[PDB]
Amino acid sequence: LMRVFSKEATRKYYLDLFKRADFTANLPKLAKKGGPDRLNDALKKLRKAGISEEKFAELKGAAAKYADDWYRIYGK
């Protein structure tokens, strides 16, 4: 049960990364670390912490929009 709660905390942390990245105002601070795949990479760790196929597909799209937002301003 300690384990369950620990994984749940980790899961909610990554889910909240995606919520934070929804907002345009949060991109400049977010873009300082992890590059365009910052959210693509967190999604891999969320999939290990447990995610439904439906939520994965949603966040797969959000992670691609993050990359697009990142390239738009920081890309070569």
Q: How far is CA 30 from the centre of its chain?
A: 10
Distance (Å, whole) CA 47 – CA 52? 8
Residue 68's CB is within 10 A of a number of other CB atoms, namely 11
Distance (Å, whole) CA 72 – CA 27? 11
Collect all residues with Cβ–Cβ distance below 8 Å to 23 and sequence separation of at least 6.
none
Distance (Å, whole) CA 29 – CA 1? 35
Enumerate residues preceding breaks in the chain (C to N > 2.5 Å). none
For this experimental structure, what is the resolution in angstroms? 1.9
CB 28 within 8 A of CB 52: no
CB 38 within 8 A of CB 27: no
For the chain, give every domain's residue range: 2-74
Q: Determine the residue type at 13.
A: Y
The method of structure determination was: X-ray
